[PDB]
Amino acid sequence: TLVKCACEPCLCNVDPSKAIDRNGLYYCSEACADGHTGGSKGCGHTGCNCHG
Ligand SMILES: [Zn+2]
Ligand SMILES: [Zn+2]
Ligand SMILES: [Zn+2]
Ligand SMILES: [Zn+2]
Fold first, then answer.
1. Are 52 and 37 within 8 A, CB to CB?
2. Count of alpha carbons within 13 Å of 8, Cβ hemisphere only?
3. Domain ranges in the chain?
4. What fold characterizes domain 1-52?
5. How far is the CA of 11 from the centre of ligand 1 (A)?
6. According to the annotation, is 19 in a ligand binding site?
7. Whose CB has fewer CB within 10 Å in the chain, the N or C terminal residue?
């Protein structure tokens, strides 16, 4: 089963065995783990406009 990503507006479905999981919290890309600091969009894959 896939689990969500830790960004509420992130529509990505990742797994906690492959994702960049820090401490129980799954991040799809580095961008959701940094929290989209400063600049604009998303997680490096298509059309996800998630902020942090
Ligand atoms: Zn995203
Ligand atoms: Zn994400
Ligand atoms: Zn994100
Ligand atoms: Zn993503």
1. yes
2. 1
3. 1-52
4. Ribosomal Protein L24e; Chain: T; (2.30.170)
5. 6
6. no
7. N
